[PDB]
Symmetry: D2
Subunit: 323 residues, 4 copies
Amino acid sequence: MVNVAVIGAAGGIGQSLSLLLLRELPFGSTLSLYDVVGAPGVAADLSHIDRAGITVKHAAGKLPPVPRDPALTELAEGVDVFVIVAGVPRKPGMTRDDLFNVNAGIVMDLVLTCASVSPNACFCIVTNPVNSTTPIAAQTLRKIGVYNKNKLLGVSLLDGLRATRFINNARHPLVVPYVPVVGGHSDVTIVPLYSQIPGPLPDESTLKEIRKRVQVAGTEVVKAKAGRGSATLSMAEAGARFTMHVVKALMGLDTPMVYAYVDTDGEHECPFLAMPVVLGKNGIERRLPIGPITTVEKEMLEEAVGVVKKNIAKGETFARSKL
Amino acid sequence: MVNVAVIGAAGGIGQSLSLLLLRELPFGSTLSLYDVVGAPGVAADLSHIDRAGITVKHAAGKLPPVPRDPALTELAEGVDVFVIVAGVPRKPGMTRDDLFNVNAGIVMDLVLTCASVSPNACFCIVTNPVNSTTPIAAQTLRKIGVYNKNKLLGVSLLDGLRATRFINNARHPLVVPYVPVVGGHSDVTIVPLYSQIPGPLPDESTLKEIRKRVQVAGTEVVKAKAGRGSATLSMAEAGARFTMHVVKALMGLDTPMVYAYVDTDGEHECPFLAMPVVLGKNGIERRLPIGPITTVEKEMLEEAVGVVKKNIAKGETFARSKL
Amino acid sequence: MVNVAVIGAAGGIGQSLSLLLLRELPFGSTLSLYDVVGAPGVAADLSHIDRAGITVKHAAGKLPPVPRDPALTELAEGVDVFVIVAGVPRKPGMTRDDLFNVNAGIVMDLVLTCASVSPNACFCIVTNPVNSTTPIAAQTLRKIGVYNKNKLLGVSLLDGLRATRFINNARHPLVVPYVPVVGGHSDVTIVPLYSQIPGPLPDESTLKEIRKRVQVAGTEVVKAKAGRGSATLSMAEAGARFTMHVVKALMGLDTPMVYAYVDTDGEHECPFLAMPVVLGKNGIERRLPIGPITTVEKEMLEEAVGVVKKNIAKGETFARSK
Amino acid sequence: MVNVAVIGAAGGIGQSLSLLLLRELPFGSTLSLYDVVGAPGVAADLSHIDRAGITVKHAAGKLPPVPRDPALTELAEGVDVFVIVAGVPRKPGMTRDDLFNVNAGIVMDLVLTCASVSPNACFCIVTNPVNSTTPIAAQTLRKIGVYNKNKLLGVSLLDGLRATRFINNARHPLVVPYVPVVGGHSDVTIVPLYSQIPGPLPDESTLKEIRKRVQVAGTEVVKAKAGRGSATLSMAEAGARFTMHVVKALMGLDTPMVYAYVDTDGEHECPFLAMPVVLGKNGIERRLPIGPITTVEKEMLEEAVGVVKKNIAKGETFARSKL
Ligand SMILES: NC(=O)c1ccc[n+]([C@@H]2O[C@H](COP(=O)([O-])OP(=O)(O)OC[C@H]3O[C@@H](n4cnc5c(N)ncnc54)[C@H](O)[C@@H]3O)[C@@H](O)[C@H]2O)c1
Ligand SMILES: NC(=O)c1ccc[n+]([C@@H]2O[C@H](COP(=O)([O-])OP(=O)(O)OC[C@H]3O[C@@H](n4cnc5c(N)ncnc54)[C@H](O)[C@@H]3O)[C@@H](O)[C@H]2O)c1
Ligand SMILES: NC(=O)c1ccc[n+]([C@@H]2O[C@H](COP(=O)([O-])OP(=O)(O)OC[C@H]3O[C@@H](n4cnc5c(N)ncnc54)[C@H](O)[C@@H]3O)[C@@H](O)[C@H]2O)c1
Ligand SMILES: NC(=O)c1ccc[n+]([C@@H]2O[C@H](COP(=O)([O-])OP(=O)(O)OC[C@H]3O[C@@H](n4cnc5c(N)ncnc54)[C@H](O)[C@@H]3O)[C@@H](O)[C@H]2O)c1
């Protein structure tokens, strides 16, 4: 059916994501789990669940981590979808540049290892910062000669989940299933488009507050966790749902419209942007326009695009220094 | 309509179980989260999920843990179902006996706090060892004069998930949805009843191996996690499923048949046993007979019951020494 | 918990609607079936399905049909939602005016009988023409003093299913789950609002043809049945879907936004209109504005409203003359 | 990827069956509708429903009916599953043997026409009497040299629905999802095996009445319909559910255990029987034993098998005389 690989499976997001995929993957599928620590334990725990027709596979990377880990090279054979959720924490004395450099190098190494074996797979990038790790992944795919602009997806759906939760909390009992969220995936680059959902909106003063809340929502969860770090359970939810949209599209079981941080393929001045796309059997099938927006949303988007172009440049600069 | 409290919500089991309940609870429900550590973070993380009509509430207990925590007393008001997943799964320097006393203490304190506010709630006990913590819960409820034998459930379903997975792996493509598991919830007390499922079984030499594997399956996960972890994702799955049977039974939206470690209410010599029950609007509606078993299963059940009887006694003796 | 009565359960729409509700109603529900012909057969057939937790009740009306059948009086006790799918869709020698009088009288007798026993029930009117039968049901409720403007719903959702299918056929692979349809529920009164759905639209000349096909879609099925039949399976699908939104709303399992032909409660000059509402535990919880529309849609809506006004007036006249 | 054809789609079963298939078929499927009268009307009616990803096709046969209708020949191209729900009513003047001869000849002609174009399809026979029409379909497929014993299925699941409904009505609140029903599919040939379901059974007088009720349920509905004929809405339900098991099995999306009236392939003296099978990608994957039964069920099955053998011979004798 499909073979979905979670890369960083023993992680905060990767354990709960792996459980939701075990529950939701179509009968006949394989769930492949990789991590440099904890992967056997996760696979042994998930393998006890009574899901008939799901094969659980895993591989353990070396500690300390090696580039091009041969356990990952073997697990990556015959994978359709790679969900990259690997990451390392900022330790006391690590600068922001050090954190960026450490996680950028992990995304490069993992995409090189996986794509050298399964170059026609979809890559779903969760590892932050998405605005930068996506275009690092593209540069890495270009370097081996297998970049497919329709199969690289920056996972930005957690913004949509938040934007939806917050507007439904404000408009109860009027509910919507989703809110378009375009631009990028961090702070000022996040642009919720409430003007494109149905029904009367709260006053513009309230909308400024809600839109701001979407932009700083990650910091809201960092503060509430008081040292345990960023969102895990809501990112498992967003990641599992996004992965299941890809899977169903690859299997011919849906043609879903989603929001993701994607190669704009000449549709925009910005070469990567969170935008609406339809997914099909070959990955992205159609790039949709952003569509009509209010003057407030257009100003937010011009500001966002300026920062996204800097985020992308920072990714490509890192990728060309190392590759 | 229903308010479900997860007591121990920031734990390895608690966080994934809370995520599943957030996804699966009926529209109009409340999900109440309590922990002595990390409760605010978890609630903040889960509150960002776009599940319309689910209210997420939390309370943080004091550290160090205090008896009868007033933050719990407040959260416990209007709760229909308490899921007790708090506990200490392991601690270097502590034996099985030391951990029994620690987990017994936790269960007594939490059940007294919760039942003093919400005496008509259902109590689902996950905290190990279930064979002792369920009767400790019963002795606690009796001490405050509110014990309802139909509202106390020891959660033993993870044995059934394991028994189903291992027999489906053996018999594919012949699949069953469940396997009766009776007796108790640890090692020698687990008795899977493969004779009671449809279709031809493997040889008895193979069945002996499968039944043994169910009994020591927890140890298989501990070993895969290098002695430093235990089953968390498979217990979240079992816990969420069993909680949702209790929720739908309370709401009149199902009358499901489940296996749980319950008060036998005079239907067996052993006063608590993992047995088949039907759930309804008032908790347990019917206690079913174990049903026909082979001589091999009868021999395992006789051995198991002798152990469960000492496990119960040990739990009731702890409870009476401290109540 | 919920008791749903299908009134006209043995008809072409009533039999398939009853089947879908039997499959989809929440565990613990009752499905109550009534007809003047065939009800015992339909109830026996449905009662054999292995749906745990659903009770199937029926009653058989006398022939020839009487005002206020006592079988219906007894079945109507404890019913939360009445789905009125009774009627005469065609008869050789009868004009559209003749069919109006027949369907109008059937809706008056059935709404009086039901509401005399269960006045707090929601009333879902499927019987055509909806533009006239919905206000006739309102005048009948008023006549016994139990009219609740939040519990009467004219079922217009078939126009939405068609509008959605036709726009999804045109824009494949881009799929939307619904299209707003406002105004009324016949011919020129049906106003699809394609400007209110996501994603790029076909050119205005194409949207012209799709909007027109929605308006005459019912004739498309009548022609394909050689003049001897009409939409039954697609109405059963729409009927069952709309009923399930009312049921979940009443049980507090959803607060859905639906398009229905409803009493506008002073939110519009036109006293009944197909417009967006949110349903809750007491029926309509919120009446939403039509919202921003294109100059073409504004023009279609102005023509539609003029015709809906005449259709309402025609209904309220029938009800006051009888 | 699946193309399911309903042959008799404008009939009392075929209209409701086609609606349920339109709702339940996987996204990407095709629903093909054929009838000698009303098929354009049903197809126009179903084609207006807002189901994304389902293609609706139809063909209309000639009236009066002709053998090897060219419209069916074209519609049958690329079909994976043929659901045969055609039939003509007994009008006054017609004996019980005029009824049998006209329906048996319709089954023969339809199977000939469809299997000449799509010999590797599954054939699901709903047309009555199933005990005879199933073996007629088999003789027909043998004459053109394409009989696959694993791809011919007599649909007997309506007896399971009824056996399940009746025992659930009697045992409430104890629910089971299915009851084994073996033998054949009419009157005394129908043998519900209540000894093989979980939980305590009602007393023998209650069981006797329920077993009898399953046997005469077809007649209970004919009487209630008081001249409108046999079951339609509950046969649409059973037929849709059966078709959906066959569909998922062909697509690799399930390996369901079902009860159907099938070629026993040397597993029983009786050459066609309602028995348990597992379905997979090539139709019947495994034929299971009837399993252990009580002396009363063994007495009922022995009588049943005597009459099923005569019903088979009645079909074969008809087919060999016309083939
Ligand atoms: N896209 C989003 O919306 C979003 C939101 C939340 C967090 N995230 C990002 O997801 C990533 C993971 O977050 P987390 O909380 O789960 O972290 P975590 O530290 O809990 O988990 C990361 C996991 O990756 C593993 N890992 C490290 N290097 C690896 C390698 N070379 N190969 C394989 N596995 C390796 C670690 O062992 C660990 O199990 C971070 O970059 C985080 O910022 C993204
Ligand atoms: N089949 C089963 O029933 C089964 C299987 C696995 C584990 N368990 C049991 O589940 C329990 C939890 O396991 P885990 O892996 O999630 O452990 P964990 O340590 O990861 O989480 C337990 C949580 O309980 C909290 N807690 C401790 N004392 C508390 C108190 N007084 N009030 C509130 N919260 C308190 C802790 O802070 C922690 O967040 C253990 O007892 C374990 O043995 C049961
Ligand atoms: N979009 C819509 O709302 C829509 C679309 C299609 C059809 N309809 C309307 O639905 C109605 C039913 O259409 P149909 O094709 O099912 O017709 P039908 O003739 O097949 O069924 C109508 C049923 O109503 C019953 N009935 C008549 N008078 C009754 C009474 N006094 N009490 C109880 N039952 C009574 C009949 O016995 C029959 O079973 C018609 O008015 C049709 O115009 C509405
Ligand atoms: N297997 C079971 O459990 C079971 C139960 C109920 C009824 N049945 C059988 O199902 C069959 C259909 O019953 P029904 O109530 O829908 O009958 P129906 O008369 O209402 O419909 C039968 C349809 O078959 C069509 N038809 C006739 N000849 C045809 C041909 N050559 N090609 C294509 N279509 C043709 C007719 O035009 C009609 O639309 C009957 O044999 C009935 O006895 C089976």
